[model samples]
Target: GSSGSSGELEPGAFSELYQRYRHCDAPICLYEQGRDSFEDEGRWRLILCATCGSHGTHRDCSSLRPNSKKWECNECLPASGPSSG
Candidate 1:
């Protein structure tokens, strides 16, 4: 079946999709492209790690790599994995 490639959703369509996905209660899966949040006023956030699964706000996840956008927690050091033997 030839469906089609999907691209960015229009604002109204995006809102509908966002509302539908946010209600899902489950652990984050790196494989699933699920949620997105944008800034409104002064609030900001830093969610699931680019490496590890730890989540928090920008201030909450200060452990992120310095001067880098990639969120890498201490537990996800390149030299080691989520856990060290």
Candidate 2:
């Protein structure tokens, strides 16, 4: 029972909620403060999955390197056994 005119809303209001929440996805967090402790040290480098953009981890925590152009997390690319010819 609401009026159509009351539904007016601006697209700009929804843009602020599109931010990504970055956190270390390592199996064992090395930082004393836990996963999101990267803020404590500026030296720590974070690497987010290029494909999924969800899983992330510290360069020191995982084998991933920040210099790499493209990188994906384990979840995005599961390990496969050697293929037989």
Candidate 3:
């Protein structure tokens, strides 16, 4: 996998770019901007980290599907542990 630009991206721009690149197996891993605070009535969105069990923005960053089958991150993986299989 590769990295993103060092600078910040304009609102909605990151969201769009993320969607276009998601097919390459990269989910939004960093928080460029914090939690999205603006919400309209009768709207619902739950953005969870695919790896860390931490809360993050989905609509604003990642393009991951709720049923996605391949999500891997180093922190979530055990290092030097006994093999289970």
Candidate 4:
């Protein structure tokens, strides 16, 4: 969850860091970039947001993944919602 420069990090309660994210008991969200090169290849961006009250609500700038390989968390948000439009 360490995507922003804020230095905020998820509890990592699963691996405690230096490992992987697992078994989170919060509103964990996973988003992807709105880019073409990435999305076309199933490598969309990953906007990670949890219900642990960390950023209080945030969102990513809709970016492509790094190296166009692994998923990347760009921003955070209170809760992923649908567009009214």
Estimated TM-score for each candidate: 0.28, 0.50, 0.24, 0.17
Can you list the residue pairs that collide in candidate 3?
none
Which clashing pairs does model 1 show? none
Question: What is the C-alpha lDDT profile of model 2 across 20-58, one tens digit per residue?
Answer: 656777655566666665654433556677875676676
TM-score of 4: 0.17
For 1-85, candidate 4 gives per-residue lDDT tens digits of 5565556667665433453232222233344322221222332322233433222111223333344322223233333564332
- lDDT by residue (1-85, candidate 3, tens digit) is 9987777646633222332222211234333433453234211233444664333343433454556554443335454764443
Global lDDT of model 4:
0.31
Q: Give the winner by TM-score.
A: 2
**Total clashing residue pairs per candidate?**
0, 0, 0, 6
| lDDT (CA) per prediction | 0.38, 0.61, 0.38, 0.31
lDDT of 3 at 74: 31
Q: What's the TM for model 3? A: 0.24
TM-score of 2: 0.50
Ranking by lDDT: 2, 3, 1, 4
Itemize residue pairs with steric clashes in candidate 4.
Answer: 32-45, 33-45, 58-76, 58-77, 59-76, 60-75
Error of 4 at 42 (Å): 4.5
Q: Write the per-residue lDDT of candidate 1 for residues 1-85, one digit (tens) a residue.
A: 6878868845633222322222212233222333343234222343444553443334222433344655544445464444445
